[PDB]
Amino acid sequence: TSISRFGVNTENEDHLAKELEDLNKWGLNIFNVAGYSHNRPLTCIMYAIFQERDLLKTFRISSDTFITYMMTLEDHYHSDVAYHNSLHAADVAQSTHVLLSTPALDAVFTDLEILAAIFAAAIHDVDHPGVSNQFLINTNSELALMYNDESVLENHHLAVGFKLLQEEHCDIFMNLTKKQRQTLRKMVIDMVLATDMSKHMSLLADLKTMVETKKVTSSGVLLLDNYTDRIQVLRNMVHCADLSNPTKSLELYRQWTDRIMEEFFQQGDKERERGMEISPMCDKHTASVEKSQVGFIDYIVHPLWETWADLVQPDAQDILDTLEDNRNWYQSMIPQ
Ligand SMILES: CN(C)C(=O)c1cccc(S(=O)(=O)N2CCC[C@H]2C(=O)O[C@@H](Cc2c(Cl)c[n+](O)cc2Cl)c2ccc(OC(F)F)c(OCC3CC3)c2)c1
Ligand SMILES: [Mg+2]
Ligand SMILES: [Zn+2]
């Protein structure tokens, strides 16, 4: 009955259960969850999140339909891609789960909005080929042609996550009302489209203008009046979870950095063999891993998370302290 307890099959139930004590914490170790779940971290963590939040009961999803859909989704993440594989998706889903329960956001979101955000996080990189939108554009990929060069992969992650609902015994949304399905689909599209880094500067600028005029209860909880403000917060939340690696404990962050660099270098080798110019950050002969992380934190991660932390103050205090310390550590590790 480990299938009834967990998403999944494992003989080391005690160890998996110990890791999952941290389900609601930023300090969860998703590498260990993967080790104790026969490398099904996405199925295992999603089943745990849905049990924890009572989402199967709320939306009348049988455990069989949910497990079937998650196993199929996880199968459609490529295990030969070094970073954008189901461990990443599992991490983003679990990080989203933690951020939804930030105290400044208590009682703000409906159950449909919670369901939408965790599902968007789970599907947001499905069927990633391990090369960038600009690679696909530069090689005249059918995917780039079909979406007119715009949010190429992100459009494709949506198309695959939604198509898999149509597989036998996979429709996790079968018992939502018609209107609830229409609203969830729109929300999920908005959140997955907001993971395209080409949109980051405009997302952040909007988020800042939102912090400027936020309303807060005594208790310090945010009042988010309308739909438009709620989906703005949710698009940024999923984006923050996608950009969360450098805010994790250093031992986790180092493992994420090893993986994104291996995936970049494998792209650069494909470029080189094709007689193409090698994309920035993808030439293993010239990369400076530690310099590059400091830049990434200074120009992208830290401005995003300081703004997020302003919105949910003081909830993200420890996240910012960890981020700053990891920045200093990587800078200190620049060779010479
Ligand atoms: C193959 N190429 C090189 C590309 O695709 C690429 C080329 C030009 C621009 C961009 S970019 O997306 O505008 N952009 C700018 C900064 C780095 C990167 C970024 O945010 O990347 C995320 C992952 C990511 C990607 Cl790839 C694509 N989208 O859409 C969204 C995301 Cl969320 C990430 C995560 C973790 C990282 O490290 C650690 F924390 F593990 C990490 O470190 C990167 C190394 C260089 C320091 C990077 C990507
Ligand atoms: Mg992506
Ligand atoms: Zn991602």
Mutate to test the pocket of ligand 1, among 264, 281, 291 (most ligand atoms within 8 A of CB): 281
- Distance of alpha carbon 21 from alpha carbon 238, whole angstroms: 23
How many whole angstroms from its chain centre is CA 16? 22
- Distance of alpha carbon 36 from alpha carbon 16, whole angstroms: 5
CA 313 → CA 76, 103, 190, 333, distances in Å? 38, 9, 25, 31
DSSP SS3 for 240: helix
Q: Is the dihedral of CA 184, 121, 307, 111 positive or negative?
A: positive
- Distance of alpha carbon 151 from alpha carbon 198, whole angstroms: 8
The Cβ of residue 307 has, within 10 Å, a number of other Cβ atoms equal to 18
Which one of the listed residues 78, 84, 157, 302 is annotated catalytic?
84
Backbone φ and ψ of 216, nearest 5° = -135, 135
What tokens appear for 290 in the block?
A: 């530690």
3-state SS, the chain, equals CHHHHCCCCCCCHHHHHHHHCCCCCCCCCHHHHHHHCCCCHHHHHHHHHHHHCCHHHHCCCCHHHHHHHHHHHHHCCCCCCCCCCHHHHHHHHHHHHHHHCCHHHCCCCCHHHHHHHHHHHHHCCCCCCCCCHHHHHHCCCHHHHHCCCCCHHHHHHHHHHHHHHHCCCCCCCCCCCHHHHHHHHHHHHHHHHCCCHHHHHHHHHHHHHHHHCCEECCCCCEECCCHHHHHHHHHHHHHHHHCCHHHCCHHHHHHHHHHHHHHHHHHHHHHHHCCCCCCCCCCCCCCCHHHHHHHHHHHHHHHHHHHHHHHCCCCCHHHHHHHHHHHHHHHHCCCC
Does the annotation flag 124 for ligand binding? yes
Mutate to test the pocket of ligand 1, among 134, 255, 260 (most ligand atoms within 8 A of CB): 260
What tokens appear for 203 in the block?
A: 């997302």
CA 78 → CA 72, 87, 263, distances in Å? 12, 10, 12
Question: Is 256 close to ligand 1, i.e. is its CB under 6 Å away?
Answer: yes
Asked whether 246 and 253 are in contact (CB, 8 A), the reply is yes
The 8-class DSSP code of residue 215 comes to E
- Distance of alpha carbon 183 from alpha carbon 191, whole angstroms: 12
Q: CA gyration radius for the chain? A: 20
Catalytic, 76? Answer no
What tokens appear for 146 in the block?
A: 């079909």
Q: List the beta bridge partners of residue 222.
A: 216
- Distance of alpha carbon 38 from alpha carbon 100, whole angstroms: 28
Asked whether 32 and 19 are in contact (CB, 8 A), the reply is yes
DSSP SS3 for 7: coil
Does the annotation flag 293 for ligand binding? yes
Question: Is the preceding omega at residue 103 within 30 degrees of 0, hence cis?
Answer: no
What tokens appear for 92 in the block?
A: 């983003």
- Distance of alpha carbon 127 from alpha carbon 144, whole angstroms: 15
Nearest Cα to Cα of residue 266 among 81, 136, 125: 81
Beta strands in 178-228 (DSSP E): 215-216, 222-223
- Distance of alpha carbon 141 from alpha carbon 231, whole angstroms: 32
Q: List the beta bridge partners of residue 216.
A: 222
- Distance of alpha carbon 205 from alpha carbon 35, whole angstroms: 39
Domains of the chain and CATH, by start: 1-336 (1.10.1300.10)
DSSP SS3 for 291: helix
The Cβ of residue 168 has, within 10 Å, a number of other Cβ atoms equal to 7
- Distance of alpha carbon 176 from alpha carbon 153, whole angstroms: 28
Q: List the beta bridge partners of residue 215.
A: 223
Ligand nearest to the CA of 121: 3
- Distance of alpha carbon 219 from alpha carbon 40, whole angstroms: 39
Q: At what angle do helices 200-212 and 227-242 cross, to 10 degrees?
A: 130
Q: At what angle do helices 111-123 and 227-242 cross, to 10 degrees?
A: 30
- Distance of alpha carbon 154 from alpha carbon 318, whole angstroms: 31
